[PDB]
Design a binder for this molecule. Sequence first.
Ligand SMILES: CN(C)C[C@@H](O)COc1ccc(Nc2cc(Nc3cc(C(F)(F)F)ccc3F)ncn2)cc1
Length: 277
Amino acid sequence: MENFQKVEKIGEGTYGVVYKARNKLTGEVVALKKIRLTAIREISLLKELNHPNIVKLLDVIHTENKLYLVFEFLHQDLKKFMDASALTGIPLPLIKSYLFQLLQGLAFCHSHRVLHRDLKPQNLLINTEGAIKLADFGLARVVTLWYRAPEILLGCKYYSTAVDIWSLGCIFAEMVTRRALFPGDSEIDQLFRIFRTLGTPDEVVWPGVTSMPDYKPSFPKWARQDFSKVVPPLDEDGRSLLSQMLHYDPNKRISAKAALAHPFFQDVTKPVPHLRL
Ligand SMILES: CN(C)C[C@@H](O)COc1ccc(Nc2cc(Nc3cc(C(F)(F)F)ccc3F)ncn2)cc1
């Protein structure tokens, strides 16, 4: 860490604090993440993901019994970009391009058995060239619960790549309506908001749901609401794809690889956003 000079705090993370730092050995600008306290192992396995839509893990430093992660640095996150766009909204061509790219990102790591586990606007990074990238990637093992898949809230321990498709679905709708899809303040509140919109799940639409660890038969039975009310601006191509991203049953939920060929991406392009840094 004598080789790194701190410039400013970027944020505070579930397992370490993150700073914008300059590498004195290279004059390079980076995101430096210091971990709190089989790990160096899986982490040193993460430096192998190379893809245009994932933030590169540049180096792993293990000194004075502490662990630093050195990442490629980007200037802006999706959440700040959405806030700056709230009055007029993100243009559909740009929403679509960002969706297409995160799906390529997700399909790549998923084919290597890497899951993200905690996608949110705050860890999706953009540049002046019109690219978006996944950050804090494979690194799991007030929190925001808004993008948590229903299987996780019900206590499933052995969940699948489908959890990331669900989180991305929620972000896709948020970009389109300029409002959070399921803004829960607790796990039960989170769970009941998804139930009110998509209907309380049963054995019919989700075989096995009633025997998930945290499922209770005393749950209120709300009916499913019409989809055209959930994301009104969205055309039917987009709405059909959103619904496949939001299937209750993780096995029925569309894969990133299949989502890429969906008709919604017929007219896809690569616009450049206007960014204030
Ligand atoms: C606008 N400023 C005033 C306020 C904030 O939005 C400050 O926003 C910024 C400013 C710059 C960046 N750039 C990054 C961030 C990053 N990792 C990362 C770490 C965390 C965590 F949890 F570790 F902190 C959360 C999300 C992450 F993407 N890797 C490369 N570049 C990100 C957000």
